[PDB]
Amino acid sequence: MDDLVFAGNKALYLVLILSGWPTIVATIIGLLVGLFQTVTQLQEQTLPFGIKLLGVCLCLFLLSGWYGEVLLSYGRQVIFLALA
Amino acid sequence: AELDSLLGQEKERFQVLPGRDKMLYVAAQNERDTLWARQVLARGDYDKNARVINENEENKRISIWLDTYYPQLAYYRIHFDEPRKPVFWLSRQRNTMSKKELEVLSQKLRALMPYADSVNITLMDDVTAAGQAEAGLKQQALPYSRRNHKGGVTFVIQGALDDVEILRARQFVDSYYRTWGGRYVQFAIELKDDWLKGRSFQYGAEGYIKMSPGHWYFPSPL
Amino acid sequence: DKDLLKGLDQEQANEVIAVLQMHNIEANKIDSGKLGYSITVAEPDFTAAVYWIKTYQLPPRPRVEIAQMFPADSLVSSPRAEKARLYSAIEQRLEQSLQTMEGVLSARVHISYDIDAGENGRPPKPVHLSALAVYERGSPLAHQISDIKRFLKNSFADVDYDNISVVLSERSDAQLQAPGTPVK
Amino acid sequence: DKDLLKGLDQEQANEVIAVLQMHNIEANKIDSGKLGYSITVAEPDFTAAVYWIKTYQLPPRPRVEIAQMFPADSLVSSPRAEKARLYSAIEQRLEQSLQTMEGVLSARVHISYDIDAGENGRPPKPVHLSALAVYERGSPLAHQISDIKRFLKNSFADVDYDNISVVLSERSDAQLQAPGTPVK
Amino acid sequence: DKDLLKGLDQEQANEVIAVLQMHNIEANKIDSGKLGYSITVAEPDFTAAVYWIKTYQLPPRPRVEIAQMFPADSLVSSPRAEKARLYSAIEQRLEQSLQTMEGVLSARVHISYDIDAGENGRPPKPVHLSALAVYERGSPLAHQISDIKRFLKNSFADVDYDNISVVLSERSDAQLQAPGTPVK
Amino acid sequence: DKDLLKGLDQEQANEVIAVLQMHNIEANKIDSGKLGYSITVAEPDFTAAVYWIKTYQLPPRPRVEIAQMFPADSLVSSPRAEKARLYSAIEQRLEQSLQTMEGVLSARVHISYDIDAGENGRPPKPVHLSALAVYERGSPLAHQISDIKRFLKNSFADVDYDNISVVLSERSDAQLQAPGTPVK
Amino acid sequence: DKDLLKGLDQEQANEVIAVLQMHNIEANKIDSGKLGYSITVAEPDFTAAVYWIKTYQLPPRPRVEIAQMFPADSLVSSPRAEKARLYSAIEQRLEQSLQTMEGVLSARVHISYDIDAGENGRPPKPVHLSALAVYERGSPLAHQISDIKRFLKNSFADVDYDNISVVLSERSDAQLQAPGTPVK
Amino acid sequence: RVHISYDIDAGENGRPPKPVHLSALAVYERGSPLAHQISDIKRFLKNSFADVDYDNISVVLSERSDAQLQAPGTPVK
Amino acid sequence: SWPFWVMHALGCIIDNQRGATLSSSSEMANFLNMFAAVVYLQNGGLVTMVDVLNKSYQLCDPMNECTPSLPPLLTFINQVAQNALVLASPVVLVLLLSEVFLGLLSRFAPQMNAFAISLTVKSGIAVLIMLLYFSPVLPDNVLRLSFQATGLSSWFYERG
């Protein structure tokens, strides 16, 4: 029981922490572009996607090999708890 | 001032006795009034010597002297209803002391209590001390078991007793101990879990046989 | 002269006075406004007064009820947190109902708490009770153990007469005379 | 005039004076406006009055009802918290209808509550009642049980006479004379 | 004149005076505006009046009805919370309808509440009643128990003639003479 | 002229004067302006007027109807809250119609209410009626019970003559002469 | 005039003074208001006072309860943190109910806590209790052990008489005389 | 001083939990018969838990040291 | 199947408030249903399931015309919805306050595109808030809503 509680607490923790850096690197560049639009008046609502695509695709570029060694380290542990 | 005015408002619960060794004994009657008179003599509002005595603890004080200078003595209790002439309840069927030997004990017990004048030694029977304990234990309709042996008897009350049979037993033991004291007969009230309150039988081939009283008991499913 | 307790409450001060006056030392209760009461004694009575404070564990703690640890201000309320608050008001209403009998000065009732039997398929266990009481002296307190058993029996779902255990006693000897002033 | 208690309200002070005057000491009920009442006794009476405060557990606590633990100001109310507020108003109405018989001065009624039946599909058990009463003296209090058990029987779903228990008693002796001032 | 109670309203003060005048002591009803009423008795009549306040538990509490625990202004109303108001309005209407008979001064009716027999598939239980009454004296109070049963039998769905219990009695003796001031 | 009651109603004061004038004591309907009415009795008649106030439970409460706690102002209404409002207006219109008969001074009608049959798997039960009436004297009131059961029989779907209980009585003696002032 | 402990409070300073007065050395309690109490002894008594501080491990720590580690002010509460808060309140209430027996000055009760059985399909275990007690001297303390096991048995669900262990002892000899000042 | 065995991971698997062990130390006042006072700490500790045995408890106790009451003494140079 | 419909309906409101489901006007509710199907299956489970099925033949044996007892069936839809709503009550109110505060942030500067700014953060707050009460609360309510064999007479009667 205490491992079923631990494995459920860690699956939600890894979802929270792996979707952390791409969702805070697409937030500062969602807010500072609009703060530039508060100084100079622009009425183009479809503007900060041009930076949001480069922000998410460059954050997923440097940490690409890092996600594989957190998914493999958690996926090998849960099967050892399953079988043994 | 005098000692019998430094105590409380009523001069009815204490009693001031003059000692032979130039002391002043205060005769209380219980433990709550013993600390009432010992607080007065402890804080020191009396310029002379005084002591606070009691029936329960000067009966324990001269039992320490007695099993050093007179061992293997059979006796019960010392009664202080008149504190200038105490009564020494001695056993009759277990002593070998003669008339000349009882007077030395009567003088050597007088020398331990300087307030007393003369100790009156009387002899009680050993079978009326256990007959009154068995007739009183049967009048309350209590389950019990008597164990006779040489030099004392014992009464054992076991079982899953209810709330009335503990209060009726405890009210009788503390009223018998005040009269006789626990030197000869001793009660052994104890609670365990078996609805057969003390008794135990074994069953085979003819009916039931009453087993001997032993320490092991069968735990009760009910 | 010398203080031994201060900052006490109202009901905490009368217990310390009633304890010290039983043991022949006279104390004084002084009010200090919003800072509570204070209790002083004389010079020769101080050594005995610290000894009876230490022995009797004075000042008394406030009495605890089981409904104090499950407060009603929480917007969530588990079924373990509703039956415990339901039991804790029954064992206070039965205690307040025992003091209106003939000759009872105080009483204290306890109930067996069952909270985890209904959550699974297990049947609920039987309920047990226990009671204490202090009777006015002059009472035959061996025949009043069956009126508390009769009153406490069918005030609940289904008890037996073995599950109720009441043990009671008579009150102590009355203290009426004044302590007395330490003269030097 | 040594003060025993201060800050008491109206109903708490009349019980303290009604207790102290029974034991040959008198008190004074001094009003203080917003700060409640106050009760003072004399100096030779102070030692006895602080003894009967500790013995009788004065001042009295306010009486507890089961409907206070489950307030009606909640947002949502469980079925466990609705039958406890219904049964707590029934046992308060049944003791107000018992003071209107002849001879009766006080009464207390207790009902057995259902707890597990609120969350389960199990059928409920039989309901048990219990009552106390105080009768004006000179009354034939032996035949007064057959009226209370008959009145209490068919005020519910289905009870039987082995599940109702009535324990009643006559009132104490009257106190009609003044205590007397301490002369010295 | 030392004051017993103050801050009482109109219906409470006419109950405290009606209790003290029965036992040969005077009382004064002093008005105070928005601060309610007050009651003062004489100094020889102070020790008796405190004892009868303690005995009769005066001042009276307000009479409780079951419709006060389930107020109508709630946003959601349970089926359990609507039969309690419906039973607690018939229980008051038969009580106000019993006073219109020949000889009745006061009456009280009690209906048997069932709320847990509604949600289930079990059949509903039979309904029980219980009534009290006070008649003027000089009446044959054994023959008037049959028409209160006849009036109460078919005011509901299906009762029997042995599921109703009527316990009634005659009024007390009339207090018509003045108490009288103490002469000193 | 000591005061008895105040803050009453126009109909609440006409019942107090009608009760006190029956027992040979006078009253005064003193108007208080914006407060209401107030009844003041004489000083020798004060003890009797307090005793008859306590006995007859005056001042009268407002008479309750069943449709008063299911108000039609809410945005949603259950069928339980719509059948109790329909039956509570039928039992008032039948009471208004019974007073126009030959000899009736007052009447009261009760109808058996239906609660559980809206949702339980049972068909609704038969209807039970109950009526009281006060007749002008000189009436052979044993023959009037066949004119009320015939009128109340087919004012509903199907009731029997066994499900209708009529309990009626002739009115009391007339009060015409003045009470009389106390000779002081 | 050499201090050894400062910054204490009210309940700790009366334990250090009561310890040092038993071993024939004096002590002076100096209040400092907001900064707490302070305790000084004489210069010949300083070498012995430091030794008895180290031996008795003074000042005393506050007593720990299980309900301090699971406070009710948290936002969420597990069932383990609700059963530990229930058992730690029963454990204090039985301790305060044993101090009202005849002769008991202090008492301490312990209950067996269970965690693992409540979550899985394994049934809960039996309950074990253990108590300590301090009796007034002069008592035959071999017969006082059966009233405590009778009181402690059916205040719980299912215990036996051999799962309860009572250990009790008479109090020490009283200390009433003053220590005495060191002359040099 | 009292130590309890910390077995808390018994609920992780389907195995039944282990027994609980206790161990206590004590310092007694000089002059006391400290051989007969070892069955009271064992009786008091026996049923404060679920189920222990009498050989799962260990009591190691000892009398206190000799009192130090005299002053140390000022040096001379 | 009463306690698993509550956890699935819990997951469909948690997944609906964060986004990811407005393409029809799931992936999260299949995890709470798979979790409750294991935390019910460890302690008891199949014992109380075949206990209900074995007590069903003790009250509704065939050739006696048993029937599913209509008058309690009508509130069955309401009960699951009420349980799901109370169970999910924190996460909806927190995501509602995150929408009032982000709507208040646009009144100070309307050139923000605050519709899509909230869409990046509500899926992280709907995980962080449910992390604080996933362990202590959720495995209790599956053992609380489980139907047992003692309530079969309130749901099944016989015509004969």
Radius of gyration of chain C, CA atoms, in whole angstroms: 22 Å
Spatial order of the strands forming the largest sheet of chain B: 1-2-3
What is the CA-atom radius of gyration of chain B, in angstroms? Answer: 23 Å
Helix proportion of residues of chain B, in percent? 25-40%
Question: Distance N terminus to C terminus of chain B?
Answer: 70 Å
- What is the helix tally of chain C? 4
What is the number of beta strands of chain C? 6
Structural class of chain B: alpha/beta
The fold-level CATH name of the largest domain in chain B is: GMP Synthetase, Chain A, domain 3
What is the domain tally of chain C? 2
Membrane topology (chains C, D, E, F, G): Lipid-anchor
Keywords (chains C, D, E, F, G): Cell outer membrane, Lipoprotein, Membrane, Palmitate, Protein transport, Signal, Transmembrane, Transmembrane helix, Transport, Virulence
Organism (chains C, D, E, F, G): Salmonella typhimurium (strain LT2 / SGSC1412 / ATCC 700720)
Function (chains C, D, E, F, G): Required for invasion of epithelial cells. Could be involved in protein secretion.
Brief rundown of the structure:
It is classed as protein transport. This is part of a larger assembly, with one copy of chain A (84 residues), one copy of chain B (222 residues), six copies of chain C and one copy of chain I (160 residues). Chain A has 84 residues and is mostly helical.
Structure, explained:
The structure is cut from a larger assembly and holds one copy of chain A (84 residues), one copy of chain B (222 residues), six copies of chain C and one copy of chain I (160 residues). In chain A, 80% of the residues lie in helices and 0% in strands. Chain A is mainly alpha-helical. Chain B folds into three domains: 53 residues, Alpha-Beta Plaits; 71 residues, GMP Synthetase, Chain A, domain 3; 70 residues, Alpha-Beta Plaits, CATH 3.30.70. Chain B is 28% helix and 21% strand. Chain B contains seven helices and eleven strands. Chain B has a three-stranded mixed beta sheet with strand order 1-2-3, with helices on one face. Chain B has a three-stranded mixed beta sheet with strand order 4-5-6, with no helix packed on it. Chain B has a three-stranded mixed beta sheet with strand order 7-8-9, with helices on one face. Chain B is elongated. Chain C is α+β, with helices and mostly antiparallel strands. In chain C, helix 4 links the parallel strand 5 and strand 6. Chain I is mainly alpha-helical. Chain I is built from six helices and two strands. In chain I, strands 1-2 form a two-stranded antiparallel ribbon. The longest helix of chain I has 31 residues. The radius of gyration of chain I is 21 Å and the shape is elongated. At the D-E interface, helix 1, helix 3 and helix 4 of D face strand 1, helix 2, helix 3, strand 4 and strand 5 of E. Chain H: Its main location: membrane. Chain H: One of its GO terms (biological process) is protein secretion. Chain H: Belongs to the YscJ lipoprotein family. Chain H: Required for invasion of epithelial cells. Could be involved in protein secretion. Chain H: It comes from Salmonella typhimurium (strain LT2 / SGSC1412 / ATCC 700720).
